[PDB]
A = this chain, B = another copy of it.
Amino acid sequence: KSEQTRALILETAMRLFQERGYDRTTMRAIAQEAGVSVGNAYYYFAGKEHLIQGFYDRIAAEHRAAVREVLARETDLEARLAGVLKVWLDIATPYHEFAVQFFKNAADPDSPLSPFSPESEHARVEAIGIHRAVLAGAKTKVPEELRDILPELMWLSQMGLVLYWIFDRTEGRERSYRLAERGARLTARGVVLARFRVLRPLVREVHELFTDFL
């Protein structure tokens, strides 16, 4: 079933370039290993970057499941965000050597692979969604002026943290997981401060700036 032999191929490719490198991995090897003509392989994915898309997509959706447990017993913002970023890290863990090799492909600004490209759109909206979940259900006061962009800013933090995590050479990535924690604490205090009357000017400013930009 197309919808089903599709996920077969995504899977054989995902494991293939993990073992080999995105670069020296051909559609043809993927087809061969998959039991599927080269032409079929291209039918489900028009070349190698569309598999990465489907991998991002796949990773986003896995992330979104493992945060059931965390969103279930954390009420306040900080603990919500922090767990979600930790859960992210936990499921990225096995893909880390791949992310380091793959980094130089995805880090090409003008490549579809870049998480900021238009191809990656479906995966951004997806991931921002989680950041919608983290606050929309956080029993912690959040000013209206901010409610509309925090998602996006939090998502940005998360890309910061991905970048940092590719290059974190500490044991088991201790430091990244620290960064998520500090990042969440810092975000959370920003919002509390945001409630302070004297600097709604400032909160307006960043509301505007954040509604304009990619």
Binding site for B on A (CB under 8 A): 100-101, 103-104, 107-110, 114, 116, 163-164, 166-167, 169, 175, 178-179, 182-183, 185-186, 189-190, 193, 196, 198-199, 201-202, 205-206, 208-209, 212-214
A193 touches B182 (CB 8 A): no
- Complex alpha-carbon distance, A201 and B192, angstroms: 11
- Contact A198 B201, CB 8 Å, known A110-B169, A186-B209: no
- Complex alpha-carbon distance, A109 and B96, angstroms: 11
* B-chain residues with CB within 8 Å of residue A100 when the two chains form the complex: 108-110
A33: min CB distance to chain B, Å: 22
B196 touches A164 (CB 8 A): no
* B-chain residues with CB within 8 Å of residue A185 when the two chains form the complex: 205, 209
